[PDB]
């Protein structure tokens, strides 16, 4: 896929609303790649953690995005994926057990969102949702990253998640 241009407007929309950082993320093998991000120069600075700036590749098993994108696959394909690349711990909170990681991916499947709190880098939080195409294929993930000292976990649940779901929903018809 190569359609990050029409999405740039929705992301700035979500940021001007909430002062946070939104992105579209693509799964490549075992790392996930940001392909668009919300940028408003009048209020956002250009210094950002690992992966909040566009370009950087992060491991799938520690990001809210990456866990969302693995939940779609079948269980045996997930298993064959955890076998290949493994789960290297990065913070005191990374999911490194296998039975635990499968039961998360099944819960992110059923529930359609993933909140990951400090599971890749200390002081960073994110909520992600799947972004589908017309055919219903999961094609990317849309996520909201911030620092745990500025945003509380239920604001992400109570407020961001509704907006996230509306925005994913209106992309579906355009991609
Ligand atoms: O959970 C994420 O998608 C995420 C995004 C950026 C940095 C990070 O540590 C995690």
Swiss-Prot record:
Protease is among the record's keywords: no
GO molecular function: DNA binding; DNA-binding transcription factor activity
Coiled-coil ranges (or none): none
Entry's Gene Ontology BP terms: 3,4-dihydroxybenzoate metabolic process; catabolic process; negative regulation of DNA-templated transcription; positive regulation of DNA-templated transcription
Induction section of the entry: By p-hydroxybenzoate.
Record's keyword terms, sorted: Activator, Aromatic hydrocarbons catabolism, DNA-binding, Transcription, Transcription regulation
Residue span, IclR-ED domain: 3-175
Function field: Positive regulator of the pobA gene for p-hydroxybenzoate hydroxylase.
Protein's UniProt name: p-hydroxybenzoate hydroxylase transcriptional activator
Naturally occurring in which organism (per UniProt): Acinetobacter baylyi (strain ATCC 33305 / BD413 / ADP1)
Lineage: Bacteria, Pseudomonadati, Pseudomonadota, Gammaproteobacteria, Moraxellales
